[PDB]
Amino acid sequence: GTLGRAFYSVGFWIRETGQALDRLGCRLQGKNYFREQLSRHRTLMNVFDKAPIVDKEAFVAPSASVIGDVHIGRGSSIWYGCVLRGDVNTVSVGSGTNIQDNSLVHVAKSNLSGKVHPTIIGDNVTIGHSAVLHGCTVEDETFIGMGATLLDGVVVEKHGMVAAGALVRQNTRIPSGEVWGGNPARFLRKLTDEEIAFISQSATNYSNLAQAHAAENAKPLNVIEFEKVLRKK
Amino acid sequence: YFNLSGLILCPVLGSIILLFIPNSRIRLIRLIGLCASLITFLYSLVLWIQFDSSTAKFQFVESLRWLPYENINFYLGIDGISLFFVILTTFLIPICILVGWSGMRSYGKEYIIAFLICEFLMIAVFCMLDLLLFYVFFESVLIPMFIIIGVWGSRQRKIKAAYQFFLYTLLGSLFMLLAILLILFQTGTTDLQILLTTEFSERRQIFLWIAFFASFAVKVPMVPVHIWLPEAHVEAPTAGSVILAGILLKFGTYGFLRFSIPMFPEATLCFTPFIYTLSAIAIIYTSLTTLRQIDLKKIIAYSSVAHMNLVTIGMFSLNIQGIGGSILLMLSHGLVSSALFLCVGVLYDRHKTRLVRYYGGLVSTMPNFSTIFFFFTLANMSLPGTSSFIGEFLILVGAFQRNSLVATLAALGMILGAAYSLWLYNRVVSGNLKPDFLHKFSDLNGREVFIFIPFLVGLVWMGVYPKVFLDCMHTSVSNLVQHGKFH
Amino acid sequence: PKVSEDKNRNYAVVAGVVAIVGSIGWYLKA
Amino acid sequence: PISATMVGALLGLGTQMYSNALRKLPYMRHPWEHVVGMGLGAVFANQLVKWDVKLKEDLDVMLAKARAANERRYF
Amino acid sequence: GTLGRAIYTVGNWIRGTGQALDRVGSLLQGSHRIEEHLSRHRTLMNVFDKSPLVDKDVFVAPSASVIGDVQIGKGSSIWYGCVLRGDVNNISVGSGTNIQDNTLVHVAKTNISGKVLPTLIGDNVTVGHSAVIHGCTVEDDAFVGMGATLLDGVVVEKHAMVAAGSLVKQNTRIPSGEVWGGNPAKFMRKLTDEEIVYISQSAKNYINLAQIHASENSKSFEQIEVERALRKKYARKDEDYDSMLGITRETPPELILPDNVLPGGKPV
Ligand SMILES: CCCCCCCCCCC(CCCCCCCCCC)(CO[C@H]1O[C@@H](CO)[C@H](O[C@@H]2O[C@@H](CO)[C@H](O)[C@@H](O)[C@@H]2O)[C@@H](O)[C@@H]1O)CO[C@H]1O[C@@H](CO)[C@H](O[C@@H]2O[C@@H](CO)[C@H](O)[C@@H](O)[C@@H]2O)[C@@H](O)[C@H]1O
Ligand SMILES: CCCCC/C=C/C/C=C\C/C=C/C/C=C/CCCC(=O)O[C@H](COC(=O)CCCCCCCCCCCCCCCCC)COP(=O)(O)O[C@H]1[C@H](O)[C@H](O)[C@@H](O)[C@H](O)[C@H]1O
Ligand SMILES: CCCCCCCCCCCCCCCCCCCC(=O)O[C@H](COC(=O)CCCCCCCCCCCCCC)COP(=O)(O)OCCN
Ligand SMILES: CCCCCC(=O)OC[C@H](COP(=O)(O)OC[C@H](N)C(=O)O)OC(=O)CCCCC
Ligand SMILES: [Zn+2]
């Protein structure tokens, strides 16, 4: 609460003083390596006590940005370039889902529009590339198309598919088994059994792929590359 | 031990704490400002408890050197006259803070800071016993009020009204400052208790009295200078009008009570018919001009000029009924008038209009507001059982004993006062609704119901048992009645 | 690498230390 | 009571935070110079009081001299 | 000498004290703040014994992520935030074809439609910002507008354009000389010769513009500090004092861009 924030700010003051002392000590010895412009990006960033909670068996890409109260289930994956920013509210990501590349799942930035709705993602939910989920909620075993732009107040029912590039207007419910596409989103066709089976299999395929990607991302950082960058003439 | 130092330092701490708080923390700013105002109000209430009512000497005196030779210094003290003014000016601030509770996100920290600096400056005005420093804090109120009028005004007219008010206040202020300087050079000091024991040559009483009247009559608008008050009052936020009418209109009368009625007993007697003439026509003219106004806030603003000019009849009567009964009217006016502007502020916040034509039939859609509005309509029209009648009647019996004619003319004030007060209520509240103009309504919320509660309790408590307030002043107002008299 | 090489910067450090010590002594001795 | 040390420390902290605010920086940007400002403000306030006392004493002596010089006119 | 050693020891003590203070301040925060770590983002990454074959002259931004079986031709460029995930199947990027900011090029799972083919991008093509490609076969000398989405199975024939903010549905062929666009991605209008010249000029301009970004994103720490000092030194000028001193300060070549990227090729 307010007592915690004061201690947080005092800790910031003391950390700043310690860093200044360390820089002064470096300057006495003649070193200037603190001036290096290193990237300050953190794949897991908190806002005071609001820190993301990521399960151990969950792949989060190093370039993915997860900020605030974000919960990641077991078997889920956040791929490269994703931005999952939930700060005024919570972002809940279920188990077995896959926030694919360059996707965005965030919550409203202010209360002026009304009440900020937490973003909820079910289980085995496929989020397409470069899709925006802005304060909506999706039930389990659903599919969100590539380039979709779900807005807040939107409920996507179980086994519901949102077509690619569709923009679902505010306070819209997609019934189970129906495909909604176009701008604005409108009913197009009813899902078939083959599409349901493919939706189910895609989640497992991406879950298996995320394990390999995490294994290739968990290797020790190469020292040959580090040495080559160090000596540049 | 509660003294005048802590009461004045509390708004200082309140304004300093908010000065260094990030504006993104909107909740914390409001909570700290409200808490500071409430703590100051409780401090004033405690200062009431330990107030001796048997000595004319100033109580809780505090001193702080200003010039190196102690010629002029910060002398703070209260008596039976300025105690209730301090209590009122500390009580009105939390109400003003609570008025802008919902929309505070746009005003920011500069709103509560301005109001707390205002409270700091007005508390010291009623507590200063030094003539020069009373002027310094007398005219330090302009900057916060100038900022309040200009920054948070309603329309583009805020530039004109602020300029006009500032110019009038300056022209009064410097003509008073010349007199203060002449008094300092002749007497030697500016301490009030020393200036009340120094004989002034009869020729210098008229000039100094006129110079003092020039600054005071502006802030208690007599006749020629009540043209800044309506414009500056209408072009002001809802809480801004409460400060201007609640307290800023009480400087002129308090200045007369503290520095004019005593320092020149001979000059006051000579100018008594002059004050009676100005006040009698002001009551007649203003209470009549009020009938032909169409703006909701421009009608109540004209209900204060008649009431405040009825006060100056009481002060110059120079008897216990007059002077003592004039104080109750200002306490009553500070509550009745400031409550009426809350009622108008309630109507304006929902429906962004003030013309009486658009309003009608609110008795069927806003019944709690109609009940509360009617009660303060009765108080504004001097009904017995209300705090206004006690002050209004005590002034009349204090002036009839001195001049029967001026008490007759002032008695027509309640004839005209009861005319527009009920006629406004009939237009705004009673009647048929007008769905063409406005159709969505909302009665008083939790804040508005709670805000009006201290006004309701404090208006009948003073109206049925004013002995609590009266017995705390008779020792102090009786020493005021006679100063040059020794028989 | 336990040597500070810049002679001019070392003299500035010595002068700053001397200034601080002298200021402390000045505030203490008088 | 209100001593010169505490009012000086508050003025020093206030002027440090005021300088930081005037440059669009956070109020508590460099804590060490906030401490330095508090110390300097306390020192300056104490020195101001100490100088004011001596200044008043000197003024009293000089006015005594002036009045003594003026009083010789009556002889 | 001895003074240098003493100053070094004092600096070591100061550094130790500062690190202890930093640790204490971190403790008072409650260990809530997540500490910044070394960058673990790999610009070029392997997935299944498959390595990208980025050519020598290609500019790959450090924030880009070329992953898996990606083959990139000479003169092309991959810009900031761009992702080329060729883990499941092949991605081939032609010569001189740039993929712009925040773009995503991904290939289907080789079974999204049964007869899936790798993502092939031809030569001298340009792909706009934030575009999404998921199994297209864009032919050479083509244009894809910013924000355009190309679903699997589409082919963009030579000298064809896809309007910005479009959605080319699956198994849709854009013929040559058309400006297919819109959310259904239906026929808009025919291409004029000025548009073809504009497409070629834009591709050449991006090939020209990638070089300064490549030369800036590969500098060492020592060169960066020197360039920053030079930029600060020559940020503002005083011709009057130089004329008084009889000197003429000229901007160093490290702060001069080639004239071929200026709006009109300004020599002075
Ligand atoms: C702008 C802020 C507004 C704050 C002012 C109001 C708040 C009240 C605090 C005012 C305050 C600080 C001034 C702050 C300066 C501002 C900082 C400037 C910028 C800094 C960044 C001075 O206020 C007192 O100072 C007295 C002078 O001494 C004066 O009394 C007149 O003096 C005669 C002359 O000779 C006159 O003839 C006579 O009529 C009065 O008796 C008066 O000025 C006043 O009483 C508080 O007093 C402080 O100073 C002295 C007490 O004296 C105390 O230490 C003293 O040291 C030795 C004496 O050197 C004494 O031997 C020693 O015994 C004593 O302990 C302090 O512990 C502290 O108490
Ligand atoms: C946790 C409890 C404690 C918690 C409290 C901890 C306290 C730590 C102890 C002492 C803190 C000391 C504070 C004193 C700080 C003074 C300001 C620092 C001054 C300073 O930049 O350094 C030297 C300068 O040299 C001096 O010209 C003047 C510098 C002379 C002063 C430096 C001498 C420092 C020695 C202090 C004694 C250490 C004794 C041991 C202390 C450790 C205890 C074991 C480095 O020059 P430089 O050219 O490489 O670079 C500077 C520098 O980068 C910036 O000032 C400018 O940006 C740049 O233009 C250039 O000027
Ligand atoms: C009087 C009413 C009461 C007011 C309150 C008084 C309170 C006591 C004073 C408190 C002062 C608090 C200051 C805390 C210490 C901070 C000083 C650090 C300055 C510093 O490190 O040196 C460089 C600049 O020097 C400087 O910034 C030095 C600036 C000095 C300006 C004035 C110099 C003295 C002039 C004489 C007095 C003024 C006229 C009076 C008639 C910093 O450099 P950088 O890192 O920021 O970058 C390049 C910018 N150049
Ligand atoms: C106890 C900590 C001493 C730390 C001393 C120190 O860091 O001096 C530098 C600071 C700021 O000066 P720079 O612009 O060079 O920042 C340099 C900055 N370190 C950076 O990282 O860029 O000087 C002051 O204002 C303080 C004046 C009062 C000094 C007592
Ligand atoms: Zn994909």
JSON list of C-alpha atoms and ligand atoms in Angstrom, two decimals, chain B residues 64-65 68 70, chain D residues 1-5 7-8 11-12 40-42 44-46 48-50 52-53 56-57, ligand 1:
[
{"chain": "B", "resi": 64, "resn": "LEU", "atom": "CA", "xyz": [7.26, 37.83, 16.81]},
{"chain": "B", "resi": 65, "resn": "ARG", "atom": "CA", "xyz": [9.70, 40.63, 16.06]},
{"chain": "B", "resi": 68, "resn": "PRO", "atom": "CA", "xyz": [14.85, 45.39, 14.51]},
{"chain": "B", "resi": 70, "resn": "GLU", "atom": "CA", "xyz": [10.38, 46.11, 17.84]},
{"chain": "D", "resi": 1, "resn": "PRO", "atom": "CA", "xyz": [10.49, 25.56, 19.46]},
{"chain": "D", "resi": 2, "resn": "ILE", "atom": "CA", "xyz": [11.49, 26.61, 15.93]},
{"chain": "D", "resi": 3, "resn": "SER", "atom": "CA", "xyz": [15.28, 26.83, 15.94]},
{"chain": "D", "resi": 4, "resn": "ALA", "atom": "CA", "xyz": [17.46, 28.23, 13.18]},
{"chain": "D", "resi": 5, "resn": "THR", "atom": "CA", "xyz": [18.88, 24.75, 12.52]},
{"chain": "D", "resi": 7, "resn": "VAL", "atom": "CA", "xyz": [14.27, 26.12, 9.51]},
{"chain": "D", "resi": 8, "resn": "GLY", "atom": "CA", "xyz": [17.61, 26.25, 7.70]},
{"chain": "D", "resi": 11, "resn": "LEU", "atom": "CA", "xyz": [14.92, 25.80, 3.44]},
{"chain": "D", "resi": 12, "resn": "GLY", "atom": "CA", "xyz": [17.92, 23.89, 2.08]},
{"chain": "D", "resi": 40, "resn": "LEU", "atom": "CA", "xyz": [24.22, 24.39, 4.07]},
{"chain": "D", "resi": 41, "resn": "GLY", "atom": "CA", "xyz": [20.80, 25.79, 4.94]},
{"chain": "D", "resi": 42, "resn": "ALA", "atom": "CA", "xyz": [21.28, 25.01, 8.62]},
{"chain": "D", "resi": 44, "resn": "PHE", "atom": "CA", "xyz": [23.48, 29.71, 6.77]},
{"chain": "D", "resi": 45, "resn": "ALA", "atom": "CA", "xyz": [20.52, 30.17, 9.12]},
{"chain": "D", "resi": 46, "resn": "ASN", "atom": "CA", "xyz": [22.72, 29.87, 12.21]},
{"chain": "D", "resi": 48, "resn": "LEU", "atom": "CA", "xyz": [22.43, 34.71, 9.84]},
{"chain": "D", "resi": 49, "resn": "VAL", "atom": "CA", "xyz": [21.15, 34.74, 13.43]},
{"chain": "D", "resi": 50, "resn": "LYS", "atom": "CA", "xyz": [24.68, 35.15, 14.81]},
{"chain": "D", "resi": 52, "resn": "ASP", "atom": "CA", "xyz": [21.94, 39.65, 13.19]},
{"chain": "D", "resi": 53, "resn": "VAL", "atom": "CA", "xyz": [22.71, 39.81, 16.91]},
{"chain": "D", "resi": 56, "resn": "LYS", "atom": "CA", "xyz": [21.89, 44.97, 16.20]},
{"chain": "D", "resi": 57, "resn": "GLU", "atom": "CA", "xyz": [24.56, 45.53, 18.86]},
{"chain": "F", "resi": 1, "resn": "LIG", "atom": "C1", "xyz": [12.73, 33.11, 6.39]},
{"chain": "F", "resi": 1, "resn": "LIG", "atom": "C2", "xyz": [12.22, 32.00, 7.36]},
{"chain": "F", "resi": 1, "resn": "LIG", "atom": "C3", "xyz": [11.27, 32.64, 8.42]},
{"chain": "F", "resi": 1, "resn": "LIG", "atom": "C4", "xyz": [11.53, 32.02, 9.81]},
{"chain": "F", "resi": 1, "resn": "LIG", "atom": "C5", "xyz": [11.44, 33.12, 10.89]},
{"chain": "F", "resi": 1, "resn": "LIG", "atom": "C6", "xyz": [10.21, 32.85, 11.81]},
{"chain": "F", "resi": 1, "resn": "LIG", "atom": "C7", "xyz": [10.40, 31.46, 12.54]},
{"chain": "F", "resi": 1, "resn": "LIG", "atom": "C8", "xyz": [10.95, 31.72, 14.02]},
{"chain": "F", "resi": 1, "resn": "LIG", "atom": "C9", "xyz": [12.48, 31.32, 14.08]},
{"chain": "F", "resi": 1, "resn": "LIG", "atom": "C10", "xyz": [13.35, 32.65, 14.15]},
{"chain": "F", "resi": 1, "resn": "LIG", "atom": "C11", "xyz": [14.80, 32.33, 14.67]},
{"chain": "F", "resi": 1, "resn": "LIG", "atom": "C12", "xyz": [15.68, 31.74, 13.47]},
{"chain": "F", "resi": 1, "resn": "LIG", "atom": "C13", "xyz": [15.76, 32.75, 12.28]},
{"chain": "F", "resi": 1, "resn": "LIG", "atom": "C14", "xyz": [15.62, 31.95, 10.91]},
{"chain": "F", "resi": 1, "resn": "LIG", "atom": "C15", "xyz": [16.37, 32.69, 9.78]},
{"chain": "F", "resi": 1, "resn": "LIG", "atom": "C16", "xyz": [15.74, 32.29, 8.41]},
{"chain": "F", "resi": 1, "resn": "LIG", "atom": "C17", "xyz": [16.77, 31.46, 7.60]},
{"chain": "F", "resi": 1, "resn": "LIG", "atom": "C18", "xyz": [17.45, 32.36, 6.51]},
{"chain": "F", "resi": 1, "resn": "LIG", "atom": "C19", "xyz": [17.87, 31.48, 5.29]},
{"chain": "F", "resi": 1, "resn": "LIG", "atom": "C20", "xyz": [18.54, 30.16, 5.80]},
{"chain": "F", "resi": 1, "resn": "LIG", "atom": "C21", "xyz": [18.69, 29.17, 4.63]},
{"chain": "F", "resi": 1, "resn": "LIG", "atom": "C22", "xyz": [15.45, 33.72, 15.22]},
{"chain": "F", "resi": 1, "resn": "LIG", "atom": "O1", "xyz": [14.37, 34.49, 15.87]},
{"chain": "F", "resi": 1, "resn": "LIG", "atom": "C23", "xyz": [14.73, 35.06, 17.02]},
{"chain": "F", "resi": 1, "resn": "LIG", "atom": "O2", "xyz": [16.17, 35.59, 16.90]},
{"chain": "F", "resi": 1, "resn": "LIG", "atom": "C24", "xyz": [16.51, 36.59, 17.94]},
{"chain": "F", "resi": 1, "resn": "LIG", "atom": "C25", "xyz": [17.96, 37.00, 17.77]},
{"chain": "F", "resi": 1, "resn": "LIG", "atom": "O3", "xyz": [18.75, 36.26, 18.66]},
{"chain": "F", "resi": 1, "resn": "LIG", "atom": "C26", "xyz": [15.66, 37.80, 17.84]},
{"chain": "F", "resi": 1, "resn": "LIG", "atom": "O4", "xyz": [15.26, 38.24, 19.23]},
{"chain": "F", "resi": 1, "resn": "LIG", "atom": "C27", "xyz": [15.64, 39.55, 19.38]},
{"chain": "F", "resi": 1, "resn": "LIG", "atom": "O5", "xyz": [17.12, 39.62, 19.47]},
{"chain": "F", "resi": 1, "resn": "LIG", "atom": "C28", "xyz": [17.62, 40.93, 19.95]},
{"chain": "F", "resi": 1, "resn": "LIG", "atom": "C29", "xyz": [18.71, 41.41, 19.03]},
{"chain": "F", "resi": 1, "resn": "LIG", "atom": "O6", "xyz": [19.92, 41.47, 19.73]},
{"chain": "F", "resi": 1, "resn": "LIG", "atom": "C30", "xyz": [16.53, 41.99, 20.02]},
{"chain": "F", "resi": 1, "resn": "LIG", "atom": "O7", "xyz": [17.08, 43.19, 20.57]},
{"chain": "F", "resi": 1, "resn": "LIG", "atom": "C31", "xyz": [15.38, 41.55, 20.86]},
{"chain": "F", "resi": 1, "resn": "LIG", "atom": "O8", "xyz": [14.24, 42.42, 20.59]},
{"chain": "F", "resi": 1, "resn": "LIG", "atom": "C32", "xyz": [14.97, 40.14, 20.61]},
{"chain": "F", "resi": 1, "resn": "LIG", "atom": "O9", "xyz": [15.34, 39.34, 21.76]},
{"chain": "F", "resi": 1, "resn": "LIG", "atom": "C33", "xyz": [14.45, 37.58, 17.05]},
{"chain": "F", "resi": 1, "resn": "LIG", "atom": "O10", "xyz": [14.81, 37.63, 15.63]},
{"chain": "F", "resi": 1, "resn": "LIG", "atom": "C34", "xyz": [13.79, 36.26, 17.33]},
{"chain": "F", "resi": 1, "resn": "LIG", "atom": "O11", "xyz": [13.41, 36.21, 18.69]},
{"chain": "F", "resi": 1, "resn": "LIG", "atom": "C35", "xyz": [14.74, 31.24, 15.87]},
{"chain": "F", "resi": 1, "resn": "LIG", "atom": "O12", "xyz": [15.75, 31.54, 16.89]},
{"chain": "F", "resi": 1, "resn": "LIG", "atom": "C36", "xyz": [16.99, 30.88, 16.70]},
{"chain": "F", "resi": 1, "resn": "LIG", "atom": "O13", "xyz": [18.09, 31.83, 16.96]},
{"chain": "F", "resi": 1, "resn": "LIG", "atom": "C37", "xyz": [18.55, 31.93, 18.39]},
{"chain": "F", "resi": 1, "resn": "LIG", "atom": "C38", "xyz": [17.55, 32.72, 19.19]},
{"chain": "F", "resi": 1, "resn": "LIG", "atom": "O14", "xyz": [18.03, 34.02, 19.39]},
{"chain": "F", "resi": 1, "resn": "LIG", "atom": "C39", "xyz": [18.79, 30.57, 19.03]},
{"chain": "F", "resi": 1, "resn": "LIG", "atom": "O15", "xyz": [20.22, 30.40, 19.39]},
{"chain": "F", "resi": 1, "resn": "LIG", "atom": "C40", "xyz": [20.71, 31.48, 20.10]},
{"chain": "F", "resi": 1, "resn": "LIG", "atom": "O16", "xyz": [22.15, 31.65, 19.78]},
{"chain": "F", "resi": 1, "resn": "LIG", "atom": "C41", "xyz": [22.72, 32.85, 20.44]},
{"chain": "F", "resi": 1, "resn": "LIG", "atom": "C42", "xyz": [22.31, 34.08, 19.68]},
{"chain": "F", "resi": 1, "resn": "LIG", "atom": "O17", "xyz": [23.26, 34.36, 18.68]},
{"chain": "F", "resi": 1, "resn": "LIG", "atom": "C43", "xyz": [22.25, 32.97, 21.89]},
{"chain": "F", "resi": 1, "resn": "LIG", "atom": "O18", "xyz": [23.38, 33.32, 22.71]},
{"chain": "F", "resi": 1, "resn": "LIG", "atom": "C44", "xyz": [21.66, 31.70, 22.39]},
{"chain": "F", "resi": 1, "resn": "LIG", "atom": "O19", "xyz": [21.24, 31.90, 23.77]},
{"chain": "F", "resi": 1, "resn": "LIG", "atom": "C45", "xyz": [20.49, 31.26, 21.59]},
{"chain": "F", "resi": 1, "resn": "LIG", "atom": "O20", "xyz": [20.26, 29.86, 21.85]},
{"chain": "F", "resi": 1, "resn": "LIG", "atom": "C46", "xyz": [18.44, 29.47, 18.13]},
{"chain": "F", "resi": 1, "resn": "LIG", "atom": "O21", "xyz": [18.49, 28.22, 18.87]},
{"chain": "F", "resi": 1, "resn": "LIG", "atom": "C47", "xyz": [17.06, 29.64, 17.56]},
{"chain": "F", "resi": 1, "resn": "LIG", "atom": "O22", "xyz": [16.12, 29.77, 18.64]}
]
